[PDB]
Amino acid sequence: MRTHSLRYFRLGVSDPIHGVPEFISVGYVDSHPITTYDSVTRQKEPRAPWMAENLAPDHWERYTQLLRGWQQMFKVELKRLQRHYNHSGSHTYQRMIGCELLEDGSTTGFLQYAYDGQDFLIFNKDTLSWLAVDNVAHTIKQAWEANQHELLYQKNWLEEECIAWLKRFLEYGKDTLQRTEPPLVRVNRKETFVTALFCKAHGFYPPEIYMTWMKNGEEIVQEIDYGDILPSGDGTYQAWASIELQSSNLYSCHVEHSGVHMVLQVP
C-alpha cells in the first residue's frame, strides 16, 4: 500500500442562518468522505457504500450517541471561547483529529482546534502537551493539561486506535481506495497574445501526481504554470502543466503517477 490517512472534522457555528447547521462532523479516508453528522439530522450516516455495507447498525447507534455528546461539548466550548474573547454574534469553532499510515509502515497522528479559522490549540502527543497561540488558548491549555488521563487517552487513540480504524476502512473500501487508474495525457498548442505547450492529464486515481516539462531531455525548464489537481466528478482527477516557447529546443512532458513514469516528446 501507499500512504493513507483517516481524519474527522467537527465544525460549530454560534448564530447559524436557517440553512446552516449548528454542528457538523465529517470523517474522511484519504479524500472520500465516509461518515457525516449534523445537528439537524442528529444521526451519524455513511457517505460511501462500502461503509454502510461493512458496519453493523450498533456502530452507527453508539457513535450517534457519542456525536450528540460531542455536539453539546462543542456548543459549550464555543460559548466559553466567545465569553473569553468578549465576542458577540456568529463565530466558528473547528476540530480536526486523524492519523496517517505511510508506505514504510510508520504512523503519524494529529489533533488540533481552531477558532474563527485560525489555529487555536495544537496537541503534541510526544511531549503530551497543548501548544497555545494566545492567552485564551493558554487558559484552555492550563485547563486541559490538568487532565493527564485524557492526554494519555488521546495518545493511545492517535497511535493505536486510529491506525486500526484506518486499516479496517481500507479493507472495507479496497476496490476504491486501493485501485489505480492510469492517466490519459495529451499535448496541446495554444496561441497567446506567442505559442505555448499544455500537457493535460485526466481520468486518474489517486489524485497525487507529478507533472513537469523538460528541454533537451536533461534540464527542467523555468516559468512553468501548473494547474491544480481537481476532481472531475466521476471519482477521477485531472491536472496540467503549461510552458511558453522563442528558441528552437526539444521539449518533452514528464508525468509520474503511482510509480509509473511517462514521457511525451513533442516535435
Epitope: 450528540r68 455528546g69 461539548m73 487517552y153 493505536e160 486506535e161
Partner: antibody, heavy 109, light 110 residues
Framework: GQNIDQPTEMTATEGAIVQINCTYQ??????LFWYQQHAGEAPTFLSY??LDGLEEKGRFSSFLSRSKGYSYLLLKELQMKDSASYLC??????????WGAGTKLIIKP | KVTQSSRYLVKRTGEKVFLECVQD?????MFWYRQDPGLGLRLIYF???????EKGDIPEGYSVSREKKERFSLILESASTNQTSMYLC????????????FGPGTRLTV
C-alpha cells in the same frame, strides 16, 4: 463476543503482596479502569491505565500490557481494611465501558 | 458528594418506583447501574446532560428523566421480580478517561 476475565476470589495473609489479574478480549481498546468496592458500599476509583507500563500510587500498583491485553492490580503490604472486591473495566473501540464481575479479596489476619 | 435515595427499599410487584441520584459536583454525565451476583455492573440508562437521555445496555422495563442537572431519576414503570438488584448511580464530567463517582447504592427487593 467481548468479555473481561478476572478471578472470582483471592485470599492472602496480612502484610503480604497480592496480584489481581485482569485479562480482556475486546475489539479495540481505550483504557482500563480499576475500582475498589467494599461490600454494600459505593465503588471507588483506583487507577486508569491506557499506555503500556506500571503506575505506582501509594501501596497500589497498576500495570497494563496492551499487546497481551492484560492488566494486574498490585497491593503491597496488605492490610485488613484492603478486604473488598476489585472491579476491572475496559473500554472498547465503540467507547462502551465493559465491566468485569469483580475479584473478592480476602485478607487473613 | 453523590447521594441517592434510601439505601434499602421494599416494594410490591406492579408498583411505580422512584429512585433518585443527586450530585453537587456540577457533573454532566450521570449513570444508573444495577449490580447482580456473578455479573459486573450493567448500564441501565445514561444521561449526557440536562434533558438528554440515551438508553443503556438493559433499558427494558426502565425509564429515566433528567430535568435538573443534579438530579437523575430512575423510574420503574411496572415492578417485576427480576428487578430485584443493587442499584448504583454515578456521575462524572464528559470524557472517556474520566472516572465516575458513585452514590451509596440502593438495595431493592421485590
Amino acid at each position: 463476543g467481548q468479555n473481561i476475565d478476572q478471578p472470582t476470589e483471592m485470599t492472602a495473609t496480612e502484610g503480604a503482596i497480592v496480584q489481581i489479574n485482569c485479562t480482556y478480549q475486546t475489539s479495540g481498546f481505550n483504557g482500563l479502569f480499576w475500582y475498589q468496592q467494599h461490600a454494600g458500599e459505593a465503588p471507588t476509583f483506583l487507577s486508569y491505565n491506557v499506555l503500556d507500563g506500571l503506575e505506582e500510587k501509594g501501596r497500589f500498583s497498576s500495570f497494563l500490557s496492551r499487546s497481551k491485553g492484560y492488566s494486574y492490580l498490585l497491593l503491597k503490604e496488605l492490610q485488613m481494611k484492603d478486604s473488598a472486591s476489585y472491579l476491572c473495566a475496559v473500554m472498547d473501540s465503540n467507547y462502551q465501558l465493559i465491566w468485569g464481575a469483580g475479584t473478592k479479596l480476602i485478607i487473613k489476619p | 458528594k453523590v447521594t441517592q435515595s434510601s439505601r434499602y427499599l421494599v416494594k410490591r410487584t406492579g408498583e411505580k418506583v422512584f429512585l433518585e441520584c443527586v450530585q453537587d459536583m456540577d457533573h454532566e454525565n450521570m449513570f444508573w447501574y444495577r449490580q447482580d451476583p456473578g455479573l459486573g455492573l450493567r448500564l441501565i440508562y445514561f444521561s449526557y446532560d440536562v434533558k438528554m437521555k440515551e438508553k443503556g445496555d438493559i433499558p427494558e422495563g426502565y425509564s429515566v428523566s433528567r430535568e435538573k442537572k443534579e438530579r437523575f431519576s430512575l423510574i420503574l414503570e411496572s415492578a417485576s421480580t427480576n428487578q430485584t438488584s443493587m442499584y448504583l448511580c454515578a456521575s462524572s464530567p464528559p470524557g472517556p478517561s474520566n472516572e465516575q463517582f458513585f452514590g451509596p447504592g440502593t438495595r431493592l427487593t421485590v
